[PDB]
Design a protein around this ligand. Structure first.
Ligand SMILES: CC(C)(COP(=O)(O)OP(=O)(O)OC[C@H]1O[C@@H](n2cnc3c(N)ncnc32)[C@H](O)[C@@H]1OP(=O)(O)O)[C@@H](O)C(=O)NCCC(=O)NCCS
Ligand SMILES: CC(C)(COP(=O)(O)OP(=O)(O)OC[C@H]1O[C@@H](n2cnc3c(N)ncnc32)[C@H](O)[C@@H]1OP(=O)(O)O)[C@@H](O)C(=O)NCCC(=O)NCCS
Ligand SMILES: CC(C)(COP(=O)(O)OP(=O)(O)OC[C@H]1O[C@@H](n2cnc3c(N)ncnc32)[C@H](O)[C@@H]1OP(=O)(O)O)[C@@H](O)C(=O)NCCC(=O)NCCS
Ligand SMILES: CC(C)(COP(=O)(O)OP(=O)(O)OC[C@H]1O[C@@H](n2cnc3c(N)ncnc32)[C@H](O)[C@@H]1OP(=O)(O)O)[C@@H](O)C(=O)NCCC(=O)NCCS
Lengths: 394, 394, 394, 394
C-alpha cells in the first residue's frame, strides 16, 4: 500500500519424480540452486540480502538448519540470517508471506523467500533409546508419518480428498477429467516452452559425468481417460473410493524461490518487478476436509485486496487431488480457463515444502507471458488450513 | 513504539532430563500444556487467538505439523492457524519475534508464541528407498545429525565451544567455576521457590497412575569444583580439550509459551502485562565460533532500544556451554550478578526448540519478582547465528 | 555295546537372565569357556580332539561359524574341525548324539560336544535389499521369528503349551504347583551346593574390572503359589489361558559341554567316565502339540536300551513350560521325585541351543552325587520333535 | 564297505543371481522343491524317509528350523525328524557325510540330505535390546557378518583368496584365464543340455502369473579375457590386488538334494544307484589361507578310498575364487580337463549352504553322462576347513 512489497525475480527447479532425476541431490543444494539464480536474475548481490526464509517440511537427516546451508551454498555470506518455516503444503507460500511482513514492518530490505523439498531423501524412522526387551519395532516412513497422515483422524490426505469428493459430489469421472486436463495442459505448456524462463537447471553428478536436468519429470504425456478409468482407487478400497494415482498429485523433489523488496527499493535499484503483492490470507478449517482450505483463504485475500473474484485473471490452486481442485472451482464458481492453465501438481508433482512457492513462480511467469494483471496463488494444508496470495503485475 | 507489543502471560513446563520425567510425553502435549496455561493466565479465550507460532527443531516422527496438534490440543479451535519455525536453538525466541512482526504490522491481534522439544523422543534415521545390494547401513541419530552437528565443518557444537574457549581464553577452571555457579544459583532459586510461578505442571500417565511433574529434573544439587575437575573432556580428546558434561548444557525435554498483543489491546481487556517488547535482533557469524552470536545480537538489540549495556538490569543468555557463556560475559564486560541469576541451561537443561522461549519466560518472571525494569534474552545458534530481545517491565 | 561311547567330563556355565549377567559375553566365549574346561577336567590335550560339535540356534550376528570360534578360543588347534547343528531346543543334545555316531562308526576318537546360546545378543532383522518405495518396514525380533514361533501355525511356543494344557488337562493350578516345586528344588540345590561341581565360572569384563560369574541368575527364591496365582496368562489372553511368565521357562544365556570317547579309549587313558551312553532317539510329532515330543522319544530310547521306565533312576525332561512337563509326567506315569529333582528351566532358564547339553550335564552330576545308575535326558522341540538319551553310570 | 551307502537320486534347483530369479522364493521352498523331486526320482515314498539333514548357513529370518519346514513342505510327514548343519561353504556336503554316518551305524535307513541358501533374502541386523542413549548404530549385513568375513582376521574371504594367490603365485592373468574357462565350459554345458537332467524347475508366483525357472541365471555368456582384464580388484585396492568380481564366485540362491540308503536297501527296492560313497574327509587349516582346505581333504579322502589321485576320473572342486581353484590344481598336479569340466561357481554361482551338495549333484550326473567311474567333490570352508568325498559309479 503506497510502497508495497514487490517480487523482482522468481525461479524454480524442475520437479523430479519420486526416486528420480533429483533424488541424489540434497535438498539444500536444490535450495542453493534457486537462491543463487533469483539473485542473479534480479542483479542483487548476495551480501545485500537481509535474510533468507524457506519452507521445508521433511527435514529429517538434512543436518542443522538446511535453509542456512542453502543460503551459504548460494554464495550468501555468513552474516545473513537464514531460517525455515513449516506449515505443511503451505510452507513455501508462507515463507513469502513472512518476507512480506518482515519487509513491510521495516526489519528487512531484501528477502529471498522460497521452499524446498527432497521427498526421495526422506528417511525411515526407528525409536531406539528405550530399547525393546522383546518384540518387533517399526521402521516408520517419515513421508507418511510427518508428511501425509492427518494427526487428528490418522488417515492419509487422500482419505480427506475422498471426504471432499463425497461432500462436494465430485465423481470418479469428474476427477479423471480434471486429471487428463491437467496432464494435457502441462504437455502443451512444455511443448510451447512456457516453463523455459522459470526453470533453472540443476547439476547432477553422475557416473557418466555431470549433467544438467532441465525438464519436469513427472508429466504423463498422452494421458487419456480410457487408461485412467481402469485404475483402482488407492486410498479407499471398500468399493466407494474414487482417488487413484492418476488423479492425485505425486510425491516429488524440487525447490523454488523469489526475491522481494519494497517498490521504492526496486525503483532505487532500477528494477522492474514481476508483480506487486496485494494481499494474503491464512485460515483454518476442519482437518477431515482440509482440501477446501483455499475457499475461505481465497475469499479473504480477494476481499482484502479490494477485488471481486471476477477481477482475478489467473489462479494457481495447488492440485493436491483432482477431487479437491474440482470442489474449489465448483464452490467458488471459477472459470476453468483461468485456473491452473499450465497444468498443476497432478502432472507436475508436489514437493511438499516447495509447492507453495513453485505455484507462485509459475503464476508470475504466466501473468507476464500472457500480459494479464491479477493473480491468485492458493494451497490447502494438512490438518485443516489454507493459504492464499493476491498479486498484480507491475 | 507508541503502541508496542506486550507480553501478558508467560509459562513453561519443567525441563526433563534425557530419557527422564517427560520422555513419554509427546512434544505436542508439552506444547498444549503451556498454550492452554498461558491463555488461562491471561484470561484470553482460545477462540480469540489470531494464530499460534512455535519453535520446534527435531520434528521427525512427530506427525503432521505438531504445532497445530499442540494448538488444537490446548482447546484452540480449528479456525486458528498454527505453524512452526526452525532456527535451531534460537527457534523458541524467533517464534516470539515473528509474533511481534505479525502483530506490529496489523495481521494478528493476539498470538500465542513459544517453543517445544522432546529430545528423548527424537528417532534414529535409515535411508531405505534405494536398497542396499550389499553392505552396512547406518541408523543415524537425528539429535546428532540434525540438532548438534555443524553442517559446514562436520563437528559437534561442543567443538565450536572449544574453538571459542581457545580464542577467548576461557580455561577449564574458568568453565567449571561458571558451571558450579550456574548449578548453585539454580539450586538456590529452587529452594526459594523462584520457579513456582512460571512452571506449569505436566500430567504423565504412569503404571502407578497419573502424576504431576513440577520440579526441574536436570539440576545437580551440591555441585562442586572438586568433582567437576575430575571429569575428562568429552568432545575433544587429544589432550587440549576443556568441555565436559558438567560444564555443558544437557539434552532435554520441555516447552514454554507467551501470550502477545498490542498494549492498546491489553488496555482494552484490562490486562496488566509482564513487559513490553522494546526491540529484537537476528545476526549471522562464522559457524566455527557460533557461540559468540549473542555478542553482535545483544549489541544491535540494545542499540535499537536506545539503551546502553549498563541500562540492562537482567540478562538471560542461554548457557549452551560454560566456555561460550564466559566468552560473551567477558567480551561484553557484563556484571555476572546481572547474568543468568537463577542459573542457566548447564543446570536447567536445553530442549533445543524450547529454550529461546524458556529463557524469556524466566527473564520476565525474574524482572517481576525483583522489581527490575530492563531485560535482555539472547541465544547462540548452530551454523553461526545469534538472536536477542529487549524487554521492559510494564 | 561292548565298546560303548562314554562321557568323561561335563560342565556348564551358569545360566544368565535375559539382558543380565552374561549379556555382554559373546556366545562363542561362553562356548570356549566350557570347551576349555571339560578338556581340563578330562585331562585331554586340545590337540587330541577329533572334532567339536555344538548346538546353536540363534546365530545371526555371531560371525562365521561361531562353533569354530569357540573351539579355537578354547585352545583347540586350527587342525581340528568344528561345526554346528540346529534342531531348535534339541540342538545341544543332538550335538552329543552326533558325536555318538561319529565315534561309534570310527570316524572320530574324541569329540567335544555341547551347546551354546546368547539370547540377549540376538539381533533384530530388517530386509533392505529390494528397497521400500513407500511404507513402514518391520524390525523383526530374531528370537520370536527364528526361535519361538511355530512355522506351521504362526503361534508362539506358549500357545502350543496351552494346546497341551487343554488336551492333557493340566490346570492353571497344576502348572503353578509344578513351577513352585521347580523353584524350590533349585533353591534347595543351590543352598546345598549341588551345582558347584558342574558350573565353570565365566569371566566378564566390567567397568569396575574383571569379575567371575558363578551363580545361576534366573531362580526366583521364595517362590510361592499365592504370588504366582495373581499373574495373568501371557500368551493366550481371551480368558481361557493358563501359561504365565512364572510357569514358563525364561529367555536366557549359557553354554554346556561334554567330552566323549569310546570306553576302550577312556580305559587306555586311565579315565573313569561319568557314564556310558546306552541309547538315544529322535522323533517327530504334530507341531501344535510339540511339547509332548519327549513321550515317544523317551519310550523309544528306553526300549532301545532294553529298559523299562521303572528302571530309570533320574530323568531330566526340559521344563519348557509347566503345562508340558506335567503332561509328560502324567502320560508316562513318572514319579515326580525322579524327575527334574534339582529343578528345571522354569527356575534355571532355557538358552535354546545350550539346554539339551545343559540338562545332560546336570543329569550326569546328579547320578554321580546320589550314586544312582540309570538316567534319561529329553527335550521337546519346536515344529514337533523330541529327543532323548539314556545314560548309565560308569 | 561290503554294504556301502549309495546315492540313488540327485537334483538341484537352478542357481539364481543375487536379487534375481529366485529372490522371492523362501529358502525352505527351494528345499521342498528338491526334496520332493529326489524322492519322486528315486520312487521312494515320503513316509519311508528316516530323517532329513540339510546344510544351511544364513538362517536369520527364516523361521523355526527351516529344514523341517522344507521337509514337511515336500510332503514328508511330521513323524520324520529334520534338522540342519552349518559348516559354512561345506554345509551341503557335510549334510551328506552326516547321512553316511547315520546310515552306516544303523540309525537311519533312508536319508534325504542336501543344502539350501537364499542369500537374496538374508537380512540386515540391528542390536536393539540395550538401547542407545545417543549415537549411530549399524544395520549390519548378515551376508558379510556371518557368511563372508573371517572371524579370526576380520577380513573378507576374498582377502584370504589374495593370500593364496600370493603364496601359490597365481597371477591376475592366471585367474582371469581360469574364470573365462569356467564361463565357457558352463556355456558349452548349457548349450549341450548337460544340466537338463539334474535341474528341477522352481515355481515362482509373479504378477503376470506362475512361471517355471529352469535355466541358471549367473553365467556370463561370451566371457573373454579382454573384458575381464579391464576390471579393478574388488577386495584389495592398494595396487597389489588380483581378485575381481569376474574371477570370484557370486552371491546366489539355490538348493540341492540327494537320496541315500545302503546298497542292500537299494537292491531290495530294485533301485540302481548313481554311485556308491567310498570315503569322505574333513580337515582344518589356517584361516588366512582357508581356500587350500581341499588339498589335505582330497589327499585324505583319496587315501581312505585306497586310490591314487590319478585314479580319480572327475573332480568338482568348488570355485570360490579362481585364485584358490588354480592353487589347488597346481599343488595337487591335477589335469584341468578332469576338474570342473561343466564349469564351476565363477559361472554358476555359490549359494553358501547349497554348494556342497550342488557340486555333488553335478559330479554324479557328469560321471553318469560320460560313463566314468571315480569322482571327488571338495570345498574350502571359511575359518580354515576343507571337506571332500569320493564316489564311484554304480
Ligand atoms: C499415490 C502414490 C502413493 C503413488 O502411488 P504409486 O503406487 O507409486 O503410483 P505409480 O506412479 O506407481 O502409479 C500407479 C499406477 O498408476 C498408473 N498411472 C499414474 N498416472 C497415470 C496416468 N496419468 N495415466 C495412466 N496411468 C497412470 C501408473 O502407470 C501405475 O500403473 P501400473 O500399476 O500398471 O504400473 C503417491 O503419488 C501419493 O501418495 N500421492 C499423494 C501425495 C500427497 O498426498 N500429497 C499431499 C497432498 S495434500
Ligand atoms: C555431553 C552429553 C553427551 C551428555 O553426555 P553423557 O555421557 O550422557 O553425560 P552424563 O549426564 O552421563 O554425565 C557424564 C558424567 O558427568 C558427570 N557429571 C555431569 N554433571 C555433573 C555435575 N554437575 N557434577 C559432577 N559430575 C557431573 C556424571 O555424573 C557422569 O559421571 P559418571 O561417568 O561417573 O556417571 C550431552 O549432555 C550433550 O551433548 N550436551 C550438549 C548439548 C548441545 O550441544 N546442545 C546445543 C548447544 S549449542
Ligand atoms: C514370558 C517371557 C516373554 C518373559 O516375559 P516378561 O514380560 O519379560 O516376564 P518377566 O520376567 O518380566 O516377569 C513378568 C512378571 O512375572 C513375574 N514373575 C515371573 N516369575 C515369577 C515367580 N517365580 N514368582 C512370582 N512372580 C514371577 C515377574 O515378577 C513380573 O512381575 P511384574 O509384572 O509385577 O514385574 C519369556 O520368559 C518367555 O517367552 N518364555 C518362554 C521361552 C520359550 O518359549 N522357550 C522355548 C520353549 S519351547
Ligand atoms: C564381488 C561381489 C561383491 C559382486 O560384486 P558386485 O559389485 O555386485 O559385482 P557385479 O556382478 O555388479 O559385477 C561388477 C562388474 O564386474 C563385471 N563382471 C562380472 N563378471 C564379469 C564377466 N564374466 N565378464 C565381464 N565383466 C564381468 C560386471 O559386468 C560389472 O561391471 P560394471 O561395473 O561395468 O557394471 C560378490 O560376487 C562376491 O562377494 N563374491 C564372493 C562371494 C564369496 O566370498 N563367497 C564365499 C567364498 S569362500
Amino acid at each position: 500500500g503506497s510502497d508495497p512489497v514487490v517480487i523482482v525475480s522468481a525461479a524454480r527447479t524442475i520437479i523430479g519424480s519420486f526416486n528420480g532425476a533429483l533424488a541424489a541431490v540434497p535438498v539444500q543444494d536444490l535450495g542453493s540452486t534457486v537462491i543463487k539464480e533469483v539473485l542473479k536474475r534480479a542483479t542483487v548481490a548476495p551480501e545485500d540480502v537481509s535474510e533468507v526464509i524457506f519452507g521445508h517440511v521433511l527435514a529429517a537427516g538434512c543436518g542443522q538448519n538446511p535453509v542456512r546451508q542453502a543460503s551459504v551454498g548460494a554464495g550468501i555470506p555468513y552474516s545473513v540470517p537464514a531460517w525455515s518455516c513449516q506449515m505443511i503444503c503451505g510452507s513455501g507460500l508462507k515463507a513469502v508471506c513472512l518476507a512480506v511482513q518482515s519487509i513491510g514492518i521495516g526489519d528487512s530490505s531484501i528477502v529471498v523467500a522460497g521452499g524446498m523439498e527432497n521427498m526421495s531423501k526422506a528417511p525411515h524412522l526407528a525409536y531406539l533409546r528405550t530399547g525393546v526387551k522383546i518384540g518387533e519395532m517399526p521402521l516408520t516412513d517419515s513421508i507418511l508419518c510427518d508428511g501425509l497422515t492427518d494427526a487428528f483422524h490418522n488417515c492419509h490426505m487422500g482419505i480427506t480428498a475422498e471426504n471432499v469428493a463425497k461432500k462436494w459430489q465430485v465423481s470418479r469421472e469428474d476427477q479423471d477429467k480434471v486429471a487428463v486436463l491437467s496432464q494435457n495442459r502441462t504437455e502443451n505448456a512444455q511443448k510451447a516452452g512456457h516453463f523455459d524462463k522459470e526453470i533453472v537447471p540443476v547439476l547432477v553428478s553422475t557416473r557418466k559425468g555431470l549433467i544438467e536436468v532441465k525438464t519436469d519429470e513427472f508429466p504423463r504425456h498422452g494421458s487419456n481417460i480410457e487408461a485412467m478409468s481402469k485404475l483402482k482407487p488407492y486410498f479407499l478400497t471398500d468399493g466407494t473410493g474414487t482417488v487413484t494415482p492418476a488423479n492425485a498429485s505425486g510425491i516429488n523433489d524440487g525447490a523454488a524461490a523469489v526475491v522481494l523488496m519494497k517498490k521504492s527499493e526496486a525503483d532505487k535499484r532500477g528494477l522492474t518487478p514481476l508483480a506487486r503483492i496485494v494481499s494474503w490470507s491464512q485460515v483454518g478449517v476442519e482437518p477431515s476436509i482440509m482440501g477446501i482450505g483455499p475457499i475461505p483463504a481465497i475469499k479473504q485475500a480477494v476481499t482484502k485486496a479490494g477485488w471481486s473474484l471476477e477481477d482475478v485473471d489467473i489462479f494457481e490452486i495447488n492440485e493436491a487431488f483432482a477431487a479437491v481442485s474440482a470442489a474449489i472451482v465448483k464452490e467458488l464458481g471459477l472459470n476453468p480457463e483461468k485456473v491452473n492453465i499450465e497444468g498443476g501438481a497432478i502432472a507436475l508433482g508436489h514437493p511438499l515444502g516447495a509447492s507453495g512457492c513453485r505455484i507462485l513462480v509459475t503464476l508470475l511467469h504466466t501473468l507476464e507471458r500472457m500480459g494479464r494483471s491479477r493473480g491468485v496463488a492458493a494451497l490447502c494444508i494438512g490438518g485443516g488450513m489454507g493459504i492464499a496470495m493476491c498479486v498484480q503485475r507491475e
